[PDB]
Amino acid sequence: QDEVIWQVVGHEFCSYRIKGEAQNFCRNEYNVTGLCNRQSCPLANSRYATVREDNGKLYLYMKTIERAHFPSKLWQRIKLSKNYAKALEQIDQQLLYWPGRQIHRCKQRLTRLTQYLLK
Amino acid sequence: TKTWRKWHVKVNQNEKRYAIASAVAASGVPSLLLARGHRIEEIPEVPLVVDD
Amino acid sequence: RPTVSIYNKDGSVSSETLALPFVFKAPIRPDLVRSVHTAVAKNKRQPY
Amino acid sequence: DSVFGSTTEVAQLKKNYFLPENIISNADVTRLINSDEIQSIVKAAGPSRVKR
Amino acid sequence: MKFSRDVTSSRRKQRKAHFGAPSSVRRVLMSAPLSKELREQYKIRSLPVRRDDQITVIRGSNKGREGKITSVYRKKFLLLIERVTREKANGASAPVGIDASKVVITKLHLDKDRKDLIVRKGGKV
Amino acid sequence: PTHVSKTRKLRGHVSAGHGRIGKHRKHPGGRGKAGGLQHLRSHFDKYHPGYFGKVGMRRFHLMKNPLWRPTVNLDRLWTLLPNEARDKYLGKNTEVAPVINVLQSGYGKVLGKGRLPETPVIVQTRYVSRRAEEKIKQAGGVVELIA
Amino acid sequence: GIDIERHHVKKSQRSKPASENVYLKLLVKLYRFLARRTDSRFNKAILKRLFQSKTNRPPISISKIAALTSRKSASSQNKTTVVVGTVTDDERMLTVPKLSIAALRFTKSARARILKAGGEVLTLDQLALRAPTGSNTVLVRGKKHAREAYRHFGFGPHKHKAPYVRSEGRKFERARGRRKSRAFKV
Amino acid sequence: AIHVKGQLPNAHFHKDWQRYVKTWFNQPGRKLRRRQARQTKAAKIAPRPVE
RNA sequence: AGCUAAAUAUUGGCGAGAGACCGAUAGCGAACAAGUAGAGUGAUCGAAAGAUGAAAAGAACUUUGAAAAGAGAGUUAAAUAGUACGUGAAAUUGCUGAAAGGGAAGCAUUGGAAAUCAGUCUUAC
RNA sequence: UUUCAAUGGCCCGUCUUGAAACACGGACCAAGGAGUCUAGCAUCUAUGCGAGUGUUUGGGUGAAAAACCCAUCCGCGAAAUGAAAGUGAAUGCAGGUGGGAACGCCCUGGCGUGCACCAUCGACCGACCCGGAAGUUUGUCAAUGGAAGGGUUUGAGU
RNA sequence: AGAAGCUCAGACGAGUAGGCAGGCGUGGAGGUUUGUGACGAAGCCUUGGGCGUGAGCCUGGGUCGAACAGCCUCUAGUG
RNA sequence: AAAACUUUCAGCAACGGAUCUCUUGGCUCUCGCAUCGAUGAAGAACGCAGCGAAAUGCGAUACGUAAUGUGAAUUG
C-alpha cells in the first residue's frame, strides 16, 4: 500500500513535487532531503521524521503507522529553542532508533536552519 | 474542420465503474489527498463522515 | 472490517460508527482512471 | 455498500456488478521482499556499487 | 451561480446589452447608492440618479467634492456635477464627468413619482 | 491525437516520407479495386483467390427467418439449465428427469459434439443429430421433438 | 575501419512491461529481485512473462489446467499451477476438481468454481511466499496461436490459410483460383 | 493500388455523401423533448393511463 | 374514389442559450458608412479598412515664418500617447561613433591586437 | 565582440548516373502557407470483461448536451461444410512420435515430466467417389430412406 | 536505492530514399503550484552574462502598459 | 596613403505596420416558435430633421402621429 502511494504520487503529479526539466525537488512539509524518492518520500513512508524552521524555533515532526487514518493526530510536534549542539543531540536521541540514516540528514538540515536563524 | 468529427467517445461501462471505485478508494487514502492538493492536515479522520 | 467514526455538526465524535465499505479496498489504478477521465471529459464538448 | 457491493457479493444498486479483484494480493512489496520467507533462501547478496 | 436559462452569462452579450442599452435602460444602469442618513430614512440601498439631485463624489481625483447634478448625460454614462469643472488651456472650463456608481446621494429631489418609487422599492416616506 | 503522430516528425524532411523518385502522386495505380485481372492480378491471385466469376445458383427473395437454426452441442446442454436445477438433478437418481427446452435458449438443433453425463435427461428441440440422439439415449435420456 | 557485420545490435527483448499498471509494476519489482537473487529459472521465466504482452499471454482454462494436471503418470498431486495470464472458466466440465492456481487474473466464474469446488486461488505474490523458488509448481502456458490472427498468417498458394473476406458465401472468394471448374485451384 | 493485407475495400462513398451526413448532436435534446411531451401528455390526459 | 393528429425533416425566417471555434492576411465577402466604394453594355464581378487617453484635458500664450510649421511653454501618469495618435518588429533609409577595403563579399579554423565582461577570490576553520 | 594574418571554403533548393553549372526556381523582409477528417480494413500495443461481450436505438433519472441507472432485442463470438438439398464434429487420459519451457529425483550429466510451439502418423465432421444394413409407407416385387464399411481426394473444420 | 534509481566492464560510432526512438517549440482544455504581475504581465530592441551536441532555454540593461507562466494529463487549423 | 565612397557592427532617428493584448464581429451546436402578398408583399425610386452626405428611421401626419408604459431628458 505504501508502494502504491509512491507509484501514484512519486513519478507524476504531486503538490510538493517540483519538476524542472531534469530534476525533482520535494518541498513537502515533512521531508528532510528536499528531493523526491521513496526512501525519503514523506507521504509514502509511514515511519519518517523531519525538521523545519518557525519564528526562530526548530520543530521536529514524526508520524507512525498506528494513526494513518486520522490526519489531525497523524503527525507529532516537538519544539526546540536551544543552541545547536543540544539541538543535535535531540535529533540524535529522537532518531537513534526510529528512521535509519535520517539521523545524519536531519543533522544536516538542522545545521542549515540554524544558520538561517542566526542570519 | 467538419461537424461529423468524433467528439464523444465510448468507454465500457465496467471500466467506467472500475474507475469510479478506484477513485473512491483513492479518496479514502490521506496521502493521495495531500498529494493532489487538499489541505487536510487538520481534519479528524479519512473518510470524513458527518451526521445526517 | 475497520470502523470509521461519525462527527456531529459541532465537530465532536458521535458514538455511532460505520464499517469501512468494501469499495475502499478496491485497487487504486491511476492509469485506468486517467484513461477513463480522458474519454469522459470529451463527452460534453460541442462541435466546431 | 449498496452502491458498489463487494468483490464476492453483488451490489444492490448495480446489477451483476462486483468490486474488481486486484492482480496482487498484498501491495507491500518491500516488506514482502524483506520478509523471512524470501531472505531465508536468497543467495548471499553480492556487493553494491563495486570497486573498479 | 445563475440557474435560469433565460439570462445569459456571455461576455459578448452582456457588454452588447450594456453599451447598446436605450435611454430608459441606461436610466437604471446609472444608479447611485444613498448616504447613511438617507438609507436609514428611506430603507433604500440605491436609486437611479436624477437631475437636480445632491451627491458627493466618493472615488477619483474629485473624491469628497459635492454639488448638484446638472445633467445625467446618459449617452456616455456620466454625471455632470456643478462646480466639478476643469480649466482648459484657453481659459474656458470643461465639465468633468463622474460615473453614477462613484457618487453617493445625500439629498433627493423628491417628486410624487419618486415617492411612489421609494415606497414601491420596499421603502417608506 | 495529433501530437504523437507522424507529420510532426517529418516536419523539415522533404517529401514527407514518400520518397523523391516517384513521389506522392494522386492515383498512380488506379482508383479502388481497379484491376485484378490486368495489373493487380499478382496481388489478387496470391491473396484473394476465387474473387472473379460465379459459383452456385441464385436464390431470389431470400429470407433468413425460415432458415434460422442455431446449433448447440451436448457439452453445453446442462449449462443451459439454471444452477439450482443442475444441483438438484445432476448425478442424483430421481424418478423425475430434468428437461431442457433448447428452443427457449435460442437453438434450432442439438449437435452431438462432446460428452453427456450419465443422468437421464429430457431434451426438447426442433432438430437433432443422429449420434447426438445416440449419446442422449446412451445417457439414459430421451429426445422430444418440438414444433 | 573494422569489418563488422552489424553495429550496435539489440536483438528483440523487452526490458519492462509496456503496461502502466501500478500493481503489475509492483509484481515485476518483486520478481526482478527474486530472479536476480535466486538461481531459479522459474523466477526468471515469471519475470519474462510479466514483461510479455496480451497476445503473448493467452488465457488458460479451468478444464485445461485439470486436463494437464490429470495426465496418467502426471504426478501433479497438490503441486500449485502457475500461469502468467488469465484463468477462464470452462462451463462444459460440470465438476471442477480440487485445484491450486496462481495467476494474474481469475474470471469471476472461474474463481467462484475453484473456491466452491475444492482448492484455492492465489496471486503471483502469494506464490512468491509459498514457493519463492517455484518448487513443485506446474508452470503452464495458453495456446498462443489459438488467436484469430494465426488463422490468416501465411496465406498464399496451397497454404490452406483463411483469406481476409468481408462475408462468407458463394460470392466471396470462391470461384477463380479456388476450384478446378473456374480455371484453376490455388 | 491495393497492396496491403486485409480484405478488399468496399466503401460505398462514390456519391455526394457529405451533403447528407446526419449527426446526432440533438440526441440529448430530443430525449428531453420526448420526456417533456410524455409528461405533458401524462398531466393532460387525466387519470387515464398514458399507454 | 376520399380524409386524417403524434412520433420524422428543417444550410431559410423569428426568438433564445451556448462553445476545448476564429481573433482583424483569422472568423461570413463584410467586427468599420459591406454586397459598400470601384469595375463591366450586360449577365455579373467585388475590395480595402478595428485600437489617442481615465477624461479632449486636442497644446492657451510668447516668438520665428507668406503660410505650412518650428522653437519655447502648456495638458497629462505619460506627448518614448499629438489624431500622420496603444504597443511599433524586419526589409529599407539618414545621422553619429568605430572598423575594413589593390577586380566581390560572406564562412570555418587558430592565435594577435583593440574594446567589453563574468566568474573566482577575499575566507572559513 | 570586432578586425587582421595563415590555411581551408564554388549557390542554395531541385529532378538526375552525374549540378558551381552556360539545367530549373530564388531582388529583399514580415505575416500566411501543404499527410487532415471520416467510413472501413490489417498488423501491433494498452485497458476492461471473458464463452461470452457490447449501457448511450431507446427508456429511467438527473435543472441537465454531462454523470448515473435500466427491460427487451440485436451485433460479433461460441460449428463446420456444400452450388444446393442437406448433413453436421471423443475407438484412446480428446491419441502416437520427434524436439522442447518450468519442475522433481539422482551423481556435471543422467532420469523422469512436458506447458507453448513447430515436423509428422492417425481418429472425428462436411463435401467428392464407391457401398446400399435397417427402418418409413406408397408403389412391399417396390417407393423412400440412409447404417456398417471402404477411397489415402478435398474444406477458410473438430 | 526520483530501482523509472545507483554501479562496473567491454565492443562500437559514415550515410541519400526510407523506417523507428527520445526530445525542443506553439495555440486551446482538466488538474496543480499559499505560482509571477501596474513597486510593470505580454510583446519588442540589445557590440551584457549563463545553460544545452542541438531543437532551445534563462537572465542583466532599454522600451513598454495588462495580463501570463512552471509541472502532470487532454487536445490541435502546432514549427 | 587621409577624406569621400562601399560594406559591416552598435546607438539614435526615419520608413513600414509585424508582434502582443483586446473584440457590441464571425463560425458551429442546441433549444423554442410558425407569421408574407390584390385589405397591394418582397424589391426598387424620389423625398422627409433648426443646422445631414451616408448609415439608421420614416412617407407630404415623412429621423415620425395616436394609444400604453416608464418618469425628466436630448446633447455636437
UniProtKB/Swiss-Prot annotation, chain B:
It is found in: Cytoplasm. Transmembrane segments: none annotated. It comes from the Eukaryota. Belongs to the universal ribosomal protein uL4 family. There are 2 genes for uL4 in S.pombe. The eukaryote-specific C-terminal extension harbors a nuclear import signal and delivers the ACL4-uL4/RPL4 complex to the pre-ribosome, triggering uL4 release from ACL4 and incorporation into the 60S ribosomal subunit. Component of the ribosome, a large ribonucleoprotein complex responsible for the synthesis of proteins in the cell. The small ribosomal subunit (SSU) binds messenger RNAs (mRNAs) and translates the encoded message by selecting cognate aminoacyl-transfer RNA (tRNA) molecules. The large subunit (LSU) contains the ribosomal catalytic site termed the peptidyl transferase center (PTC), which catalyzes the formation of peptide bonds, thereby polymerizing the amino acids delivered by tRNAs into a polypeptide chain. This is Large ribosomal subunit protein uL4B. It comes from Schizosaccharomyces pombe (strain 972 / ATCC 24843) (Fission yeast).
UniProtKB/Swiss-Prot annotation, chain C:
Signal peptide: none annotated. There are 2 genes for uL4 in S.pombe. Component of the ribosome, a large ribonucleoprotein complex responsible for the synthesis of proteins in the cell. The small ribosomal subunit (SSU) binds messenger RNAs (mRNAs) and translates the encoded message by selecting cognate aminoacyl-transfer RNA (tRNA) molecules. The large subunit (LSU) contains the ribosomal catalytic site termed the peptidyl transferase center (PTC), which catalyzes the formation of peptide bonds, thereby polymerizing the amino acids delivered by tRNAs into a polypeptide chain. Belongs to the universal ribosomal protein uL4 family. Component of the large ribosomal subunit (LSU). Mature yeast ribosomes consist of a small (40S) and a large (60S) subunit. The 40S small subunit contains 1 molecule of ribosomal RNA (18S rRNA) and at least 33 different proteins. The large 60S subunit contains 3 rRNA molecules (25S, 5.8S and 5S rRNA) and at least 46 different proteins. uL4 is associated with the polypeptide exit tunnel. uL4 interacts with its chaperone ACL4 and the nuclear import receptor KAP104. This is Large ribosomal subunit protein uL4B.
Curated annotation (Swiss-Prot), chain F:
PROSITE patterns: RIBOSOMAL_L15 (PS00475). Gene3D superfamilies: 3.100.10.10. Keywords: Cytoplasm, Ribonucleoprotein, Ribosomal protein. GO terms for molecular function: structural constituent of ribosome. GO terms for cellular component: cytosolic large ribosomal subunit; preribosome. One of its GO terms (biological process) is cytoplasmic translation. It holds the Pfam family Ribosomal_L27A. Component of the ribosome, a large ribonucleoprotein complex responsible for the synthesis of proteins in the cell. The small ribosomal subunit (SSU) binds messenger RNAs (mRNAs) and translates the encoded message by selecting cognate aminoacyl-transfer RNA (tRNA) molecules. The large subunit (LSU) contains the ribosomal catalytic site termed the peptidyl transferase center (PTC), which catalyzes the formation of peptide bonds, thereby polymerizing the amino acids delivered by tRNAs into a polypeptide chain. Belongs to the universal ribosomal protein uL15 family. Component of the large ribosomal subunit (LSU). Mature yeast ribosomes consist of a small (40S) and a large (60S) subunit. The 40S small subunit contains 1 molecule of ribosomal RNA (18S rRNA) and at least 33 different proteins. The large 60S subunit contains 3 rRNA molecules (25S, 5.8S and 5S rRNA) and at least 46 different proteins. HAMAP family: Ribosomal_uL15. This is Large ribosomal subunit protein uL15A. It comes from Schizosaccharomyces pombe (strain 972 / ATCC 24843) (Fission yeast).
Curated annotation (Swiss-Prot), chain H:
It is found in: Cytoplasm. Component of the large ribosomal subunit (LSU). Mature yeast ribosomes consist of a small (40S) and a large (60S) subunit. The 40S small subunit contains 1 molecule of ribosomal RNA (18S rRNA) and at least 33 different proteins. The large 60S subunit contains 3 rRNA molecules (25S, 5.8S and 5S rRNA) and at least 46 different proteins. This is Large ribosomal subunit protein eL13. Component of the ribosome, a large ribonucleoprotein complex responsible for the synthesis of proteins in the cell. The small ribosomal subunit (SSU) binds messenger RNAs (mRNAs) and translates the encoded message by selecting cognate aminoacyl-transfer RNA (tRNA) molecules. The large subunit (LSU) contains the ribosomal catalytic site termed the peptidyl transferase center (PTC), which catalyzes the formation of peptide bonds, thereby polymerizing the amino acids delivered by tRNAs into a polypeptide chain. Belongs to the eukaryotic ribosomal protein eL13 family.
